[PDB]
């Protein structure tokens, strides 16, 4: 019963954390390669 709504709630909070990570990534230092930034950004989110 709880997980039913937890799905959407997790979606929203995940989007929010994504935006926070995007802000800090664009603030740290403007990396051409996609995986490098992307994989690193994902790693930062999981890690910090």
């Amino acid at each position: 019963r709880m997980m039913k709504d937890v799905f959407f709630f997790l979606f929203f909070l995940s989007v929010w954390l994504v935006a926070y990570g995007v802000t800090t990534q664009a603030l740290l230092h403007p990396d051409g390669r996609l995986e490098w930034i992307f994989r690193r950004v994902l790693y930062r989110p999981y890690l910090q």
Binding site: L10, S14, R39, L42, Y43, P45, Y46, L47
Partner: peptide, 19 residues
Amino acid sequence: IFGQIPLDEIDELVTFLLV
């Protein structure tokens, strides 16, 4: 589980499972 995530050995879905 105790805050030790060695991305050097696991990274060359998962996030959803953790949460």
